[PDB]
Coordinates of C-alpha atoms and ligand atoms in Angstrom, one line a residue:
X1 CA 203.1 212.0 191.9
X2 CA 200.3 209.1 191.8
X3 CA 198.4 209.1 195.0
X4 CA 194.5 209.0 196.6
X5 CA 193.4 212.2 196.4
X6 CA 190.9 214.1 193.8
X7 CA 193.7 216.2 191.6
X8 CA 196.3 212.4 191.8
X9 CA 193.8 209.7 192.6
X10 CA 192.3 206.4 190.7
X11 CA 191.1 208.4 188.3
X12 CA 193.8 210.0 186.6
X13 CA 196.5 207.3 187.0
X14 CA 195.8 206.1 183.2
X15 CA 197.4 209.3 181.9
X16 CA 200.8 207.7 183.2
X17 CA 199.9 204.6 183.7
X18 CA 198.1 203.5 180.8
X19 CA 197.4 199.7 181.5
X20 CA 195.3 201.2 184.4
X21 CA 192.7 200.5 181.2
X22 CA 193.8 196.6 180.6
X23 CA 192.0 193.7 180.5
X24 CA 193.3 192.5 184.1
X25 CA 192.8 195.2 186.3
X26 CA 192.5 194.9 190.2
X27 CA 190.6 195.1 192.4
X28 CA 187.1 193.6 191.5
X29 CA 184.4 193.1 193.0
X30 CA 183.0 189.1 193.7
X31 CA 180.0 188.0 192.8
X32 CA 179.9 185.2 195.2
X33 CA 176.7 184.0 193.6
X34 CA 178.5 184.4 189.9
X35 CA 181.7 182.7 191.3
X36 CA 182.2 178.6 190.5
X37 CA 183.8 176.0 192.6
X38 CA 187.1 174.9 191.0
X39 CA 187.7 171.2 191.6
X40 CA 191.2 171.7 189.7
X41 CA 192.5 174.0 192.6
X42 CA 195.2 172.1 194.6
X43 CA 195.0 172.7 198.7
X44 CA 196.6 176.0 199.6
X45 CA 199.7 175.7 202.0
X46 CA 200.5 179.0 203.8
X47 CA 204.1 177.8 205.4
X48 CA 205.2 181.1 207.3
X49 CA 206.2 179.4 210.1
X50 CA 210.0 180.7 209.3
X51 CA 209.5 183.7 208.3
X52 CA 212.2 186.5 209.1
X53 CA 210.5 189.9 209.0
X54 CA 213.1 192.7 208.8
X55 CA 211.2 196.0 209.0
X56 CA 208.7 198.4 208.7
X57 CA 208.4 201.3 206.3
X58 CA 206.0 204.2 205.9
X59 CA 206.0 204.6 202.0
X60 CA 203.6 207.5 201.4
X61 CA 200.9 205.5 200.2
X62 CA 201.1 203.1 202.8
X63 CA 203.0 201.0 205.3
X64 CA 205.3 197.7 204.3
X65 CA 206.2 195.3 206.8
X66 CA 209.2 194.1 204.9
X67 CA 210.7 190.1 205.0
X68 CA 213.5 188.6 204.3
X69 CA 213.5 186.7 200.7
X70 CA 216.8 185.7 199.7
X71 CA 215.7 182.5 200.8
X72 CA 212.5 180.3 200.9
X73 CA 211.5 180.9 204.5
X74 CA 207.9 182.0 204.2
X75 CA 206.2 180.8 201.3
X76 CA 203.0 180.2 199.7
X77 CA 202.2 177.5 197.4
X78 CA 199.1 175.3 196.3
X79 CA 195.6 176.2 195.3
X80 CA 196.1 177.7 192.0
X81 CA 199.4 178.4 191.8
X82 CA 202.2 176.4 190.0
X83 CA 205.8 176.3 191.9
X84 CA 206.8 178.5 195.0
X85 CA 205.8 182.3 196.0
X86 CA 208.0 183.9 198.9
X87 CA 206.6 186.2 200.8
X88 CA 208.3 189.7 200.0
X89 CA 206.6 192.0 202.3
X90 CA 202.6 192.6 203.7
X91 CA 200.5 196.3 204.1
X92 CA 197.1 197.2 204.3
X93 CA 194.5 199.7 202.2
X94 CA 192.4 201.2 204.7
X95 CA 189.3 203.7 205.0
X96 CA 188.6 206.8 206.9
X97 CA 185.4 205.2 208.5
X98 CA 184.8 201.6 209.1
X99 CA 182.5 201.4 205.8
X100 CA 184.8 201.5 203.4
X101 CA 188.5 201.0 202.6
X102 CA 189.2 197.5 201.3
X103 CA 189.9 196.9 197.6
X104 CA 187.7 193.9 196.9
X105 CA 184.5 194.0 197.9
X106 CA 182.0 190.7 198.4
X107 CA 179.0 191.3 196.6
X108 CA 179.4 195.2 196.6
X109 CA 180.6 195.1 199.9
X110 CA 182.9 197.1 201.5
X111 CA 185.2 196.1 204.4
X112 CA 187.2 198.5 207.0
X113 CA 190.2 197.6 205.6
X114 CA 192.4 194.8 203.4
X115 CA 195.9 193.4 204.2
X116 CA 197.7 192.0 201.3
X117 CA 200.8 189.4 201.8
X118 CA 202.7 189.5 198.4
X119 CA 204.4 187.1 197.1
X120 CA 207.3 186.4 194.3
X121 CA 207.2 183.0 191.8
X122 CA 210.7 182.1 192.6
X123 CA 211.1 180.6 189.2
X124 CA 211.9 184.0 188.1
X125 CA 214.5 184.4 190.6
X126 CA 214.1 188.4 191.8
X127 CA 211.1 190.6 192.6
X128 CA 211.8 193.0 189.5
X129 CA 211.8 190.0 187.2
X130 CA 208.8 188.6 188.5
X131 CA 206.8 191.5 188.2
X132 CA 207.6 191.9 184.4
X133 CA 205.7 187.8 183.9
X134 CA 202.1 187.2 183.7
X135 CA 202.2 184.7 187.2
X136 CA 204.9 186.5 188.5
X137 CA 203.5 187.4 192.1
X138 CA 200.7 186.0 194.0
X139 CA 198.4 188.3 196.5
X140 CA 197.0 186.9 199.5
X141 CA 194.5 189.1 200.5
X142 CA 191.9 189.1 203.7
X143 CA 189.5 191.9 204.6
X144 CA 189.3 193.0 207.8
X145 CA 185.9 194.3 209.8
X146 CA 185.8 195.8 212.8
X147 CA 184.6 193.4 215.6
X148 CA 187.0 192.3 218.7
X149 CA 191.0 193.4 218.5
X150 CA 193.2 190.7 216.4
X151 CA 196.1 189.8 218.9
X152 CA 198.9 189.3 216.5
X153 CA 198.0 192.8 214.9
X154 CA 199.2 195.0 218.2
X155 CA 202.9 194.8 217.7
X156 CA 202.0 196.8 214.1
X157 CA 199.9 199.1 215.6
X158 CA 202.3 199.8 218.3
X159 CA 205.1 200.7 215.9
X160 CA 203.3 203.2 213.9
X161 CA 203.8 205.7 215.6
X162 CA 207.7 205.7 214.7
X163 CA 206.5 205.8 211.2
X164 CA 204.5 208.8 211.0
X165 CA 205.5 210.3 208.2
X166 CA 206.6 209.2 204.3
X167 CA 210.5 207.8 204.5
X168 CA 210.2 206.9 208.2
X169 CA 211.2 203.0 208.9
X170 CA 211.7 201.4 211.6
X171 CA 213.3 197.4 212.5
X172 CA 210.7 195.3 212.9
X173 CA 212.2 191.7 213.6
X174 CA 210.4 188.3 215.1
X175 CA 207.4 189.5 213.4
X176 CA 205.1 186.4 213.0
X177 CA 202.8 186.8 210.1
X178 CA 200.9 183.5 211.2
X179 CA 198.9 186.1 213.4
X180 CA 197.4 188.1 210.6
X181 CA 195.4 185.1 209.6
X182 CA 191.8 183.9 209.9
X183 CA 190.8 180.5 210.8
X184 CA 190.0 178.9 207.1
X185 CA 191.6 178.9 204.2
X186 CA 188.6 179.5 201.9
X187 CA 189.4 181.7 199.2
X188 CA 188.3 183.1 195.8
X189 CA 190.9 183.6 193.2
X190 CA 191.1 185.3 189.8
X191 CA 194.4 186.9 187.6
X192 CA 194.8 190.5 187.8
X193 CA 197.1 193.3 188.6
X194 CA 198.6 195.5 191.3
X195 CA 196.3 198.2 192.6
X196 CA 198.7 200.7 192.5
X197 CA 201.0 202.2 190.0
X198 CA 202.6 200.8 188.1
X199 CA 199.9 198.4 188.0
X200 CA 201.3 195.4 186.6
X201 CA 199.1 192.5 184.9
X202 CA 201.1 190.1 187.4
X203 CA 199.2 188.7 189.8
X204 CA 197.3 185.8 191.1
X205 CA 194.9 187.1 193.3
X206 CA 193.9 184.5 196.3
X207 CA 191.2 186.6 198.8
X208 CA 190.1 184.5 201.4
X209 CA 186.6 184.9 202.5
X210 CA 187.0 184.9 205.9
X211 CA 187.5 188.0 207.4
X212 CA 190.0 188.9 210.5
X213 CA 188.5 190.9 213.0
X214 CA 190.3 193.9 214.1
X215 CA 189.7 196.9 216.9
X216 CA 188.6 199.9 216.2
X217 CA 191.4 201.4 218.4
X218 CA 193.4 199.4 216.1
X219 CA 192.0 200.7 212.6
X220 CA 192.0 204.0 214.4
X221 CA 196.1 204.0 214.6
X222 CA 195.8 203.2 210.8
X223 CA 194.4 206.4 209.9
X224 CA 196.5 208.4 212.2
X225 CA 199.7 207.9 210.0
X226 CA 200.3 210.6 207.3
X227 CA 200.8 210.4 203.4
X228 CA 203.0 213.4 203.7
X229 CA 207.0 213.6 204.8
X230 CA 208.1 215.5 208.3
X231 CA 207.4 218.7 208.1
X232 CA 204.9 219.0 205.5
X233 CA 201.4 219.4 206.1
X234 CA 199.5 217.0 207.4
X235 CA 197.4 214.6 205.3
X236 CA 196.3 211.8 207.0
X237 CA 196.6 208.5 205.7
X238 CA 193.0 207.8 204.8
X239 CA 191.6 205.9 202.1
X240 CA 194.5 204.0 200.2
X241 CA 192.5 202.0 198.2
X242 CA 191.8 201.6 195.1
X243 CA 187.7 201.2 193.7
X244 CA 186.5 197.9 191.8
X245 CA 187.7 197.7 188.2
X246 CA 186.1 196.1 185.4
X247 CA 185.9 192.4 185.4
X248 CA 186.2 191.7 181.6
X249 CA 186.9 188.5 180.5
X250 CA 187.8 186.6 184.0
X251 CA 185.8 184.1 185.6
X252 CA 186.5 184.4 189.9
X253 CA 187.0 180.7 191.4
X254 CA 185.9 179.1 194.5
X255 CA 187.9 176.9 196.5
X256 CA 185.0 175.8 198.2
X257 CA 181.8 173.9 197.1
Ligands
6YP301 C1 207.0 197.4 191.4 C2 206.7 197.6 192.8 C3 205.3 197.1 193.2 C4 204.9 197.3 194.6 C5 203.5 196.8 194.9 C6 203.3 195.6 195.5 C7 202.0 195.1 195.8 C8 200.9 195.9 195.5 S1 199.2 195.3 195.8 N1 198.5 196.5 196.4 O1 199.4 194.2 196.7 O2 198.7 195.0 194.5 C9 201.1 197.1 194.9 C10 202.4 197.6 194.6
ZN302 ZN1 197.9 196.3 198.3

């Protein structure tokens, strides 16, 4: 019964989750001044360019755009990561005003939202394996602001509203993720976990510093989706996000000088 508000939030998700404590929690906050270049990192290749999206599901905590992975059609490799990652699925955490709702923040800061693209280590050949290894997923994650609308993200937004509620799904082929992307590459990356139960010490987190722009009729449609099923009260799917945890004993890495 994990979720985001006072009585299920952040806050009490140790009592069932108790690596909600550990010593490679995220999100975190980057200190972009505390943060080193990384000559070692290899370049990054994002190769979505075959990527087979299959369809879009409102989960209750928030919405999956789902891919195809039996195969390695949209993949992520490079930087810091040894072998092949296929993409499993994307969503986004998401505030209810434009001042807060991403995950990461940049130096305390806060973004309107933050889309995540996860990603399996094929090596361990399943999803449910891979989560149970140290470098068994890679995150790619990029904050959005609110500026000017982002193309590529209005076939999401116009879907939504076939997904209102928990359990609802709905196809979403001949999605091209390529869209959801900023023009560099730049990224920060550190080892950490998922940010929601059952937060799993088994992922390589890759944040790029650029952020995509994104309407605010668009973020708007965000928050109009509901954490509850059909016929339940309405909650409104508002602040999915998890806060900065502590940093311990990581070091965040520049990709860039
Ligand atoms: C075992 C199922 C895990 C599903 C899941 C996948 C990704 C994330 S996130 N927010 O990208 O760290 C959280 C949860
Ligand atoms: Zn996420």
């Amino acid at each position: 019964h994990w979720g985001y508000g006072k009585h299920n939030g952040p806050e009490h998700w140790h009592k069932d989750f108790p690596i909600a404590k550990g010593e490679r929690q995220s999100p975190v906050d980057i200190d972009t001044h505390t943060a080193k270049y990384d000559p070692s990192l290899k370049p990054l290749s994002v190769s979505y360019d075959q990527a087979t999206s299959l369809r879009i599901l409102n989960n209750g905590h928030a919405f999956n755009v789902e891919f195809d992975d039996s195969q390695d059609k949209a993949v992520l490799k490079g930087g810091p990561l040894d072998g092949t990652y296929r993409l499993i699925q994307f969503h986004f955490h998401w505030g209810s005003l434009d001042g807060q709702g991403s995950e990461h923040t940049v130096d305390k800061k806060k973004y309107a939202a933050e889309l995540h693209l996860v990603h399996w280590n094929t090596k361990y050949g399943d999803f449910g394996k891979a989560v149970q290894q140290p470098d068994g997923l890679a995150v790619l994650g990029i904050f959005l602001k609110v500026g000017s609308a982002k193309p590529g993200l209005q076939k999401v937004v116009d879907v939504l509203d076939s997904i209102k509620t928990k359990g609802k799904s709905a196809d979403f082929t001949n999605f091209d993720p390529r869209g959801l992307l900023p023009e560099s590459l730049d990224y920060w990356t550190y080892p950490g976990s998922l940010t929601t139960p059952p937060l799993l010490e088994c992922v390589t987190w890759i944040v790029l510093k650029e952020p995509i722009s994104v309407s605010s009729e668009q973020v708007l449609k965000f928050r109009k989706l509901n954490f509850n099923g059909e016929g339940e009260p309405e909650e409104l799917m508002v602040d999915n996000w998890r806060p900065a945890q502590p940093l311990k004993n990581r070091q965040i890495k520049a990709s860039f000088k």
